[PDB]
């Protein structure tokens, strides 16, 4: 139940404001900046502020803070979801989210803001559907918004019927400084870019552990997805009844399902790093990277960030394979490797200087984060089985999909 | 299928070598099609196995079945989940319709000795589906 959705800037100027209820004075935004400054300088800054009886719940964008005032006990989660939908719409309409578009796209921004939410209740958020009634370059609204299917416009015709899938893996690892891994979760993400003719009803089928157990095939390699979050197109009743994944894909690239399950297997990359930090004299970086992944897979663009001293200078890198660059902006040793064959082992021996005078305040120990991205490798073992493309007109679809394995929260706690 | 014919002798020898009673990861061939085995494909495979021999009367074992499924998946791209048999005790019917192979006793179902026996009626009669309608949905 937001009161006024506004767009701020990095200096406190309200780039654009659009009140939906009028229950909050338009001059209350002037106190948001001083309140945020007071909160950030005392450690009490929060995305949801409070100006007397008025709360300012907002998120931080690339260059603007999407603040939305409210007064009653509105659903803060609803406000956050509306802000996220607005950010996604802005990203879909404008390729960049900066001040260069707020002062230049006011003609369409006001229309989008007016159409998106009325009286504090958003009603339309489909960027592909919204692109048919509000344009920056108007006919009656499409029947898709009034119709039940509000994510697939009817009458779409293409010369071919190509659906490209993207099974992107997310390897998140939380390795403590003692050498054990605490949080090792794998978050699957099936992102497809559908290009079909008509309103096809895709019937996705994978090698799910629950599906295999129900069929009676609970003995082969089946992914044990603890959490499966389907898109709005996926029918919840069909999935709940017998694990039937039936949904009409939209036109373009979108996130169909987002799997999330834990993993009890050894890490793909083992990072044995040591720190021979002499007191104000020098330091050594005995970093060893052991690839526990399969030797048949190659991790393209391996980037193991090694946080070196913030005041380190005159650095030297004695490594084995891969370029080693020290970035003073990020204050870390960027162990960049282009191609790392599975089972490979690269050894590096860093050595940098240190000022004689000690620092005034502590600097902390940022965790070492690898940036491995191994294509054509599914760690969870989930394999797509079938995709029932059904159309009333009748056509022969050509489904396609690729598996990409990358690093998620692949951090390693330092000593 | 020249590749299938070539792999049949080595596969049969490996299965015979394995008694009736190290590398991690799941590599995938790039651009290699992967889909469940079809009824026609299963029938063709059963006919080829019957003609060439080596599977009819061979003692049923987990290792041999796994090796056969892996070889079939490597040579054709068929997931190794269609080579399932109905739970015992007694004759085990193939879960996938079209497969003409079944396990019959040779003497708890896990201790009963079973062997592969050809059955052309399986490709037309869904014994597994009738026995386990819930397993077929």
């Amino acid at each position: 139940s937001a009161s006024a959705v506004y767009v701020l800037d990095l200096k406190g100027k309200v780039l654009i404001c659009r009140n939906y209820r009028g229950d909050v004075d338009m001059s209350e935004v002037e106190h948001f900046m001083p309140i945020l400054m007071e909160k950030e300088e005392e450690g009490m800054l929060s995305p949801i502020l409070a100006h007397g009886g008025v709360r300012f719940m907002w998120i931080k964008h690339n260059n603007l803070y999407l603040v939305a005032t409210s007064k009653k006990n509105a659903c803060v989660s609803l406000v956050f979801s509306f802000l996220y939908k607005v950010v996604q719409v802005f990203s879909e309409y404008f390729k960049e989210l900066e001040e260069e578009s707020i002062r230049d796209n006011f003609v369409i921004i006001y229309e989008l803001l007016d159409e998106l939410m009325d009286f504090g209740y958003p009603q339309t958020t489909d960027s592909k559907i919204l692109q048919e009634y509000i344009t920056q370059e108007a006919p009656r609204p499409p029947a898709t918004v009034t119709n039940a299917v509000s994510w697939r416009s009817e009458g779409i015709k293409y010369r071919k019927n190509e659906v490209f899938l993207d099974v992107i893996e997310a390897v998140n690892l939380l390795v403590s400084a003692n050498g054990n891994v605490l949080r090792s979760e794998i978050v699957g993400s099936i992102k497809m870019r559908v290009f079909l003719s008509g309103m096809p009803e895709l019937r996705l089928g994978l090698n799910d552990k629950v599906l295999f157990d129900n069929t009676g095939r609970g003995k082969s390699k089946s992914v044990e997805l603890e959490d499966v979050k389907f898109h709005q197109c996926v029918r919840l009743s069909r999935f709940e009844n017998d694990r039937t994944i039936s949904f009409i894909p939209p036109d373009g690239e979108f996130e169909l399902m987002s799997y999330r399950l834990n993993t009890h297997v050894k890490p793909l990359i083992w990072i044995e790093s040591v720190i021979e930090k002499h007191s104000h004299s020098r330091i050594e970086y005995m970093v060893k990277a052991k690839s526990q992944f399969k030797r048949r897979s190659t991790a393209n663009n391996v980037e193991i960030h090694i946080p070196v001293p913030n005041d380190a200078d005159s650095p030297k890198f004695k490594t084995t394979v891969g370029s080693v660059k020290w970035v003073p902006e990020n204050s870390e040793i960027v162990w960049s490797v282009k191609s790392f064959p599975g089972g490979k082992e690269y050894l590096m021996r860093a050595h940098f200087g240190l000022p004689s005078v000690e620092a005034e305040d502590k600097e902390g120990k940022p965790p070492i984060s690898v940036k491995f991205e191994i294509p054509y490798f599914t760690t969870s073992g989930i394999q797509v089985r079938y995709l029932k493309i059904i159309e009333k007109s009748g056509y022969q679809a050509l489904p396609w999909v690729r598996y990409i394995t990358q690093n998620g929260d692949y951090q390693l706690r330092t000593q | 299928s020249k590749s299938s014919v070539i792999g049949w002798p080595a596969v049969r020898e490996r299965m015979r070598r394995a008694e009736p009673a190290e590398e991690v990861g799941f590599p995938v061939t790039p651009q290699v099609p992967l889909r469940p085995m079809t009824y026609k494909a299963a029938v063709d495979l059963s006919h080829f196995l019957k003609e060439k021999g080596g599977l009819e009367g061979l003692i049923h074992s987990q290792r041999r079945q796994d090796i056969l499924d892996l070889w079939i998946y490597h040579t054709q791209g068929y997931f190794p989940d269609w080579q399932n048999y109905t739970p015992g005790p007694g004759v085990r019917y193939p879960l996938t319709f079209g497969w003409c192979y079944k396990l019959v006793p040779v003497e708890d179902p896990e201790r009963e000795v079973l062997e592969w026996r050809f059955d052309s009626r399986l490709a037309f009669h869904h014994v597994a589906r009738e026995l386990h309608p819930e397993y077929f949905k």
């Binding site: 992107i168 069929t215 089985r385 489904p399 990409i404 | 651009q31 992967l34 889909r35 469940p36 269609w82």
Partner: peptide
Amino acid sequence: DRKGGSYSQAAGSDSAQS
């Protein structure tokens, strides 16, 4: 070609389960 693994064709349904 494409970085992250070559795209592969998918099936239509579980042909082995009818």
